[PDB]
């Protein structure tokens, strides 16, 4: 019977926080900020205010146009039926151009809407990167969050823009839909011979699994050391308390080595961005310098060989 530090029991509500004052060139923040009891159980209860700047507003405008174009094409695909839109919600999409158009501009209803939606969505994420970059600089912080986001954009641009351009056709890019973009993910692996054999896909999984592993470790460690005020990590970095000592000692005694309170966030930071960086690189390599990842794996001696269990099929057209 002990407090498990899962939900906050006792809460205190002060005045709503306007935030750290910005330089006298940024737009005023919004004036709407409230407190939610439900969100205070997990963490900070205050919702709002939000900053709306030049890049923030422009990113929303590009993002809305992208979402409207995708949504209207989805709704038109089911003959404007809201009932069929709900029924087919996971299946509808905005389809990329067919392969015949290459990298040229296709007609609106033959991949043109996809290219416009992709362009405006790319602009919105690029402007959102600048928005995240400027907010960190305005408060005098480092731009680590912005560059972590830029790593995510790299995979977003590699999958949807850079790799299709290298392949010479917009058709290879991914449709704007839920199940259709899962179909693209599977068809990508089928087309290029089991993307499991892509080494950068393996590495991207290493850091994806390692990110969940690291946050499970770090999240549990901080919650386990929450008795000693471990969640106050800034103070524990500039002034090492016993929580940082116990957290470091917990993992040292467990697996022989440990990080610091600051350095575990570097580990988590790099694991998250390496997942997305290696993923983007692996997508760029396939189709461009590797045709069949399994045959590439056989060429490098990594494909296992299985003993006979059945009578092998022989290609009748071979």
């Amino acid at each position: 019977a002990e407090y498990q530090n899962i939900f906050t029991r006792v809460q205190v509500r002060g005045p709503t926080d306007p935030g750290v004052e910005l330089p006298a060139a940024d737009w005023p923040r919004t004036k709407g900020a409230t407190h939610s009891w439900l969100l205070g159980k997990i963490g900070d209860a205050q919702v709002g205010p939000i900053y709306l700047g030049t890049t923030g507003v422009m990113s929303i405008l590009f993002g809305i146009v992208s979402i409207v174009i995708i949504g209207m094409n989805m709704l038109a695909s089911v003959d404007w039926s809201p009932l069929e839109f709900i029924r087919q919600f996971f299946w509808v999409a905005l389809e990329p151009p067919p392969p015949e158009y290459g990298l040229s501009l296709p007609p609106l209803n033959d991949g043109g809407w996809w290219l416009i939606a992709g362009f405006t969505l790319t602009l919105s994420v690029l402007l959102w990167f600048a928005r995240t970059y400027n907010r960190a600089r305005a408060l005098g912080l480092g731009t680590h969050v912005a560059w972590a986001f830029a790593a995510a954009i790299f995979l977003f641009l590699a999958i949807g823009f850079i790799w299709p351009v290298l392949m010479g056709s917009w058709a290879k890019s991914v449709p704007f839909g839920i199940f259709p973009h899962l179909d693209w993910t599977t068809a990508f692996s089928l087309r290029y011979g089991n993307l499991y054999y892509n080494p950068f896909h393996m590495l991207s999984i290493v850091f994806l699994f390692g990110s969940a592993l690291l946050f499970a470790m770090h999240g549990a460690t901080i919650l386990a050391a929450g008795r000693y005020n471990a969640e106050r990590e800034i103070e524990q970095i500039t002034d090492r308390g016993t929580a940082a000592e116990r957290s470091a000692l917990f993992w040292r005694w467990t697996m022989g080595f440990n990080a610091t309170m600051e350095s575990i966030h570097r580990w988590g930071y790099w694991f998250a961005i390496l997942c997305v960086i290696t993923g983007g690189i692996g997508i760029l390599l396939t189709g461009t310098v590797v045709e069949n990842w399994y045959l590439w794996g056989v060429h490098h001696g990594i494909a296992p060989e299985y003993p006979e269990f059945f009578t092998p099929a022989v290609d009748p057209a071979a």
């Binding site: 060139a25 030049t54 290459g102 990298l103 040229s104 501009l105 602009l123 600048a130």
Partner: protein, 46 residues
């Protein structure tokens, strides 16, 4: 029209314009390359 720079930071406007010019120039040059007529490196005939 000189009162703009009283209202707006001259530096932040310049980055805004440069980013707009860089993005627009790249997009226009890319669109021309996609065409079968203005693709100068492809050397297509009219």
């Amino acid at each position: 029209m000189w009162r703009l720079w009283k209202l707006y930071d001259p530096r932040r406007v310049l980055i805004g314009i440069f980013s707009w010019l860089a993005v627009l120039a790249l997009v226009i040059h890319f669109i021309l390359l996609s065409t079968d007529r203005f693709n100068w490196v492809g050397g297509a005939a009219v």
